C-alpha cells in the first residue's frame, strides 16, 4: 500500500490570505503509464467529498483558478492562493496510481478571527437523574476563539480529571467560533457527599480564568 | 441532476451480515466504473470495492477481501455491497462513488458492527442553577444520555428555534453515547415563553420532548 501522509493536520488562515497542504506518499505514484493519479478532495462537514484536483496539477471542471497543484516525487502540494469561507473543511489528497487506492488522513482548514472569550454556564443533574441514581453535571463554554481552551473542574475546591467527557462542535459557520460540553458524571452518593462544583474555562496564558459555580446545598 | 443514493445502513451483530445498495440517475450507469468507499469515525476514508462498468471486473483492498463483495445490476442502476462475517473494524460512512478517480459521491449510508445493545435515551433537561442570573441572555440545555446506536435528532420547540443553538458530537463511554445541546434565549423571554427540548431516536423508536422549567 502507498501510505499518504498529509501536513498539516489544521490549518487556520485568514479569510483572502493563502494555504498551502502537503501530501507525501511512501512511494512512487508514477503508474505504468507514465502518469501520476494525484487527485484532491474537499470534504464540507455535513457533505460528501467533492474533487478538485485531478493528476497532480488539473483543476476539476468548476474549480476556480484559485486552487492549483504541484509536486511529482514523493511530494505533493495544494495552494489555495487567497481563501474564501466556502473552501473551509477537511481537505484530502488522494492516489489512483497503484490498487488499493489510498487517501491522506485530512487537513482541516479553519478559518481564523479574533480571539474571543467563551461564555460559560454550569448546570447541576436535574432532578429526574437524581431519582436514576446518576448525576452528571454539565459545563458550556460557548463561542469562543482559538479552538485550543482549557477546562477544570474542582469538587469543593480540589480538582477532578477523572469522570468527565469532552465535546467541540465544528468552527460555526457564521462567527468562526468554536463551542465546547464538558460533562463531568458521578454517582448520586458521589454528587451528595459534596458540595461545590466549579467549571473553570482558560487558556494558560489567558489572564482571565472564568469560574462558574453552584453550591448543591 | 446526476445523483447516488446509498440505503441498507443498519446496525448489525459482529459476525452478522448486511446487503447496502446504490441507486444511481443522470447518467449511463453501464459505462461507469464504481467503487465503494468507508469513512471511519475517525474521518479516515478507505477505499473498500470497485467493479467495472459491465460487471466482469472487481477489486478489493485485502483487509476486505473474501468477506465484502460488490455487485452492479445495470438494468436496475443499482450497484450493491454484501458484506458479512462483519466486525467492529466496518463500521463506517459507506460512501458510493463513481470512477471518472470518483468524480460523483453518494451522501453515504451508516454501518455499525457491534454486540452492544439497542438502548433508548434518558433526556434530562438543563436549567440554570436556582439562582436567578443575570445578563440580556439565558443558556439553557437537554442532557442525552446513555444511548446506542447513533443517531440521535435533537431540536428545540419543534424546530421553530434554530437560531443560537450548538448539538455537540456524541461521546462514546463503554457501550453507550452520551450528547448534550445547548439553546442561547433573551432572558426576558425564559421561563415566560416555553423551551423544549424534542429528541428522537429512531433505533429505538422513540421520541422525547422535555419541557425546560425553572428548577426550585
Known amino acids: 500500500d502507498v501510505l499518504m501522509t498529509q501536513s498539516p493536520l489544521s490549518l487556520p488562515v485568514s479569510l483572502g490570505d493563502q494555504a498551502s497542504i502537503s501530501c507525501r506518499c511512501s512511494?512512487?505514484?508514477?503508474?505504468?503509464?507514465?502518469?501520476?493519479?494525484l487527485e484532491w478532495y474537499l470534504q464540507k462537514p455535513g457533505r460528501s467529498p467533492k474533487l478538485l484536483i485531478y493528476?497532480?496539477?488539473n483543476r476539476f471542471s468548476g474549480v476556480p483558478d484559485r486552487f492549483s497543484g504541484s509536486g511529482s516525487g514523493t511530494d505533493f502540494t495544494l495552494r489555495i492562493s487567497r481563501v474564501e469561507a466556502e473552501d473551509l473543511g477537511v481537505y484530502y489528497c488522494?492516489?489512483?496510481?497503484?490498487?488499493?487506492?489510498?487517501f491522506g488522513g485530512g487537513t482541516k482548514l479553519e478559518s481564523k478571527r479574533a480571539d474571543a472569550a467563551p461564555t460559560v454556564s454550569i448546570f447541576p443533574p436535574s432532578s429526574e437523574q437524581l431519582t436514576s441514581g446518576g448525576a452528571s453535571v454539565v459545563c458550556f463554554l460557548n463561542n469562543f476563539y482559538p479552538k485550543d481552551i482549557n477546562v477544570k473542574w474542582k469538587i469543593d475546591g480540589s480538582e477532578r480529571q477523572n469522570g468527565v467527557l469532552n465535546s467541540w462542535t465544528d468552527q460555526d459557520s457564521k462567527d468562526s467560533t468554536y463551542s465546547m460540553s464538558s460533562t463531568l458524571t458521578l454517582t448520586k452518593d458521589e454528587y451528595e457527599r459534596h458540595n461545590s462544583y466549579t467549571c473553570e474555562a482558560t487558556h494558560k496564558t489567558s489572564t482571565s480564568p472564568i469560574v462558574k459555580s453552584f453550591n448543591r446545598n | 441532476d446526476v445523483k447516488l443514493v446509498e440505503s441498507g445502513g443498519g446496525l448489525v451483530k459482529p459476525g452478522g451480515s448486511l446487503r447496502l445498495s446504490c441507486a444511481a440517475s443522470?447518467?449511463?450507469?453501464?459505462?461507469?466504473?464504481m467503487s465503494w468507499v468507508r469513512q471511519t469515525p475517525e474521518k479516515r476514508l478507505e477505499w473498500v470495492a470497485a467493479?467495472?462498468?459491465?460487471?466482469?471486473?472487481?477489486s478489493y483492498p485485502d483487509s476486505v477481501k473474501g468477506r465484502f463483495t460488490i455487485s452492479r445490476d445495470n438494468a436496475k442502476n443499482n450497484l450493491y455491497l454484501q458484506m458479512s462475517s462483519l466486525r467492529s473494524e466496518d463500521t463506517a460512512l459507506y460512501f458510493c462513488?463513481?470512477?471518472?478517480?470518483?468524480?460523483?459521491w453518494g451522501a453515504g449510508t451508516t454501518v455499525t458492527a457491534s454486540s452492544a445493545k439497542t438502548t433508548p435515551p434518558s433526556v434530562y433537561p438543563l436549567a440554570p442553577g436556582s439562582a436567578a442570573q443575570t445578563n440580556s441572555m439565558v443558556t439553557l440545555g437537554c442532557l442525552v444520555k446513555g444511548y446506542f446506536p447513533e443517531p440521535v435528532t435533537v431540536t428545540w420547540n419543534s424546530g421553530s428555534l434554530s437560531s443560537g443553538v450548538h448539538t455537540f458530537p456524541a461521546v462514546l463511554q463503554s457501550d453507550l453515547y452520551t450528547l448534550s445541546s445547548s439553546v442561547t434565549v433573551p432572558s426576558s423571554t425564559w421561563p415566560s415563553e416555553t423551551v423544549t427540548c424534542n429528541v428522537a431516536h429512531p433505533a429505538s423508536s422513540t421520541k422525547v420532548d422535555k419541557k425546560i422549567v425553572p428548577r426550585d
Open positions: 462513488a463513481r470512477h471518472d478517480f470518483f468524480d460523483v
Open positions: 443522470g447518467f449511463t450507469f453501464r459505462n461507469y466504473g
Open positions: 467493479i467495472s462498468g459491465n460487471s466482469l471486473y472487481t
Open positions: 512511494q512512487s505514484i508514477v503508474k505504468s503509464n507514465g502518469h501520476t493519479y
Open positions: 493528476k497532480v496539477s
Open positions: 488522494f492516489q489512483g496510481s497503484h490498487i488499493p487506492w489510498t
